[PDB]
Amino acid sequence: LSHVQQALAELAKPKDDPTRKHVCVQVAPAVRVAIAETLGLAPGATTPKQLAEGLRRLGFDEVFDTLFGADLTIMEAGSELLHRLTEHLEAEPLPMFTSCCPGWIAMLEKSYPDLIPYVSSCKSPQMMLAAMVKSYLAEKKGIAPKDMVMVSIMPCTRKQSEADRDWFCVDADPTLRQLDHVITTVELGNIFKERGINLAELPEGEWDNPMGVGSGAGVLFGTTGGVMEAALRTAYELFTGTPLPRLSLSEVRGMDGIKETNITMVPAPGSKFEELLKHRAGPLAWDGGAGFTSEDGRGGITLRVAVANGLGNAKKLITKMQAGEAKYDFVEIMACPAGCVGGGGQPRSTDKAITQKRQAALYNLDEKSTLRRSHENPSIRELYDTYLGEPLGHKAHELLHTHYVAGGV
Ligand code: SF4
Ligand SMILES: [Cl-]
Ligand code: NA
């Protein structure tokens, strides 16, 4: 009856049982780093492939990395940000708010419904991957979507409410969910312990590529800095023709839980963006944007970015934004004070710095030194080229975008 119980019941069916479904799991990075703590070990003390092996030992037919879903979110959100910028340069409002945290989306709908048009229409990484699995991958494997079960392992006690939004379903049948069951880090750790599975003693397993062909997880080596940063990078690099380094946000004096950075953007020589800047020179009192110019006319825009952690802190930021005392163009609100590594589904620790330890072990040092870019991922390129079309296009909109409901759902 619980979602854990339903998922385990699907796995309990022998693989050759005529009523067996194709049971898929996707795993968030915050889960991978914290799951070792369920054994009393340090964050990161078990490897990603040990976790993949453990999941395969529970009976999962596919084991996916949610980072594949995040590459889709980066493609869509980066394009969406650049589109809003483009529309505003040529005279879907700015500022844009990210949409990946369901705690934020719940507060948005209930308490700030007038802000709905400013929020990204992107689904979350877990929902984009789920939508893809029950469309593209089902078709590829010749499996009816109703015979697919999608489970996510999340650090978050709110991701089931996200998955349960009614229209996240296949062909307007609300009982055919894109994402069926969410299991938290601690629930999964309990499942392993109840079965005598010790992740730390497992051999390395393998990931499956959600494209259904090829080796590995379908995500390239390296790190992005997360969906918000990589969406910014996508827009910035197209706008300027120059690389965006890893960001370092600074604390905002006088506002708890708020960090910021300003990103100066000069359009690439000969680009449409350069043309737009030169030729064409609501609830949130947006100031028409920050810009700069030089004596010879090489002008640019300055993108003002904020991240709010904690919903109380976000409410204070929104108050200041409405007052015009805080001026931002792109804002990420996450409900958890420490972000997802400190989510409500994570192990409890006496270590006041456990979330710092989780963040540090979240990706290895070799991968942290390497910046990767979602649009360079051959699996992502193939999916757009042969199935989705263009970011923000009709098919991408259908599978990967969503809407919001004033008053909540
Ligand atoms: S910040 Fe917290 S509530 Fe929001 S997605 Fe992450 S774990 Fe869930
Ligand atoms: Cl997600
Ligand atoms: Na594989």
Author numbering: 65 to 155, 161 to 350, 363 to 490
Text from the published report:
Crystallization of HydA1 exclusively succeeded for apo-protein, which carries the [4Fe]H-cluster but lacks the [2Fe]H-site. Variants of HydA1 apo-protein were crystallized in space group P32 2 1, with a single chain in the asymmetric unit. However, comparisons of crystal structures of CpI apo- and holo-protein with apo-HydA1 demonstrated that a lack of cofactor does not affect the configuration of the putative PT pathway. For the corresponding alanine variant of both, HydA1 and CpI, shifts of the conserved water molecule in the putative PT pathway can be observed. While glutamine occupies the entire space of the native carboxyl group and thus clearly interrupts the putative PT pathway, an exchange to alanine may support additional H2O molecules to bridge the gap.
[FeFe]-hydrogenases represent one of natures’ most effective classes of redox enzymes catalyzing the reversible reduction of protons to dihydrogen (H2) at turnover frequencies of up to 9000 s-11–3. With their low catalytic over-potential, [FeFe]-hydrogenases represent excellent models for a regenerative and likewise economically feasible H2 production. Their active center (“H-cluster”) can be structured into a standard [4Fe-4S]-cluster ([4Fe]H) and a diiron site ([2Fe]H). Theoretical studies suggest that the most probable PT pathway comprises of strictly conserved residues E282, S319, E279, and C299 (from surface to H-cluster, numbering corresponds to CpI), including two protein-bound water molecules (Wat826, Wat1120 4XDC19, chain B) located between E279 and C29915,16,20. In this study, site-directed mutagenesis (SDM) is used to investigate the PT pathway of two [FeFe]-hydrogenases, namely CpI and HydA1, which represent the largest (M3) and smallest (M1) type of monomeric [FeFe]-hydrogenases, respectively.
